[PDB]
Amino acid sequence: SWQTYVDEHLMLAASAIVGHDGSVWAQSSSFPQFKPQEITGIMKDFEEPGHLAPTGLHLGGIKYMVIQGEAGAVIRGKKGSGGITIKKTGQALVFGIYEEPVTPGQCNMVVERLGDYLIDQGL
DSSP, X not given: OHHHHHHHHHOOOXXXXXXXTSOEEEEOTTOOOOOHHHHHHHHHHHHSTTSSTTTXXXXXXXXXXXXXXXXXXXXXXXXXXXXXXXXXXXSEEEEEEEOTTSOHHHHHHHHHHHHHHXXXXXX
């Protein structure tokens, strides 16, 4: 099915590809439903680094503490044992959520791999 191909190719606790406009292109079975305001805040942080830091990154209501990202290209957050990685591409956002014992470096690897895939196609 569309969902198995997706899960099978975005997996990581959850992953997702969403347009800069907030539309969902693909999301894993366990990815959270989120609010547009959550996407606006992230988009502003790719523009003005450090923008989310003061309030934390929220996604599907979950609060992630912002940590060292890649200015204007990748954002990272910590939550208890796991965290999140978000990479901005020409037209989308690649989201990667990890949990113990997956490592931040492992999540980063997958989000970057997906980013390369989309940028390669002009997305």
